[PDB]
């Protein structure tokens, strides 16, 4: 109708490591699309809220956390 005649960074997000399926368990079993981003989750408002409100105090010992369980025995070790 109306065809009258006359007369995106695909390899870049894989290279950088993003848009790859991943999940954080302690945060709402949340999904993360990049490993740099998830490594940035370790310092965040909500992530520290889950830790501290969970009883697992903040900052740098708990950085490598994924599941809620293991860091509980880690905090008992603390």
């Amino acid at each position: 109708e109306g065809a009258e005649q006359v007369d995106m960074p695909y390899w870049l997000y894989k290279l950088h490591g993003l848009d790859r399926e991943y999940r954080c368990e302690i945060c709402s079993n949340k999904v993360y699309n990049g490993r740099r981003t998830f490594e940035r989750h370790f310092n965040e408002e909500r992530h520290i809220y889950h830790l501290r409100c969970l009883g697992i105090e903040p900052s740098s010992v708990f950085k490598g956390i994924t599941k809620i369980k293991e860091a509980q025995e880690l905090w008992k070790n603390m």
Binding site: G64, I65, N77
Partner: peptide, 21 residues
């Protein structure tokens, strides 16, 4: 394969460590 999937969790590894961070 099995050895790659045999790995302990990093948090399981933290307890063995005096300076876990």
């Amino acid at each position: 394969k099995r050895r790659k999937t045999e790995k302990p969790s990093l948090s399981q590894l933290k307890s063995q460590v005096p300076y876990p961070q």
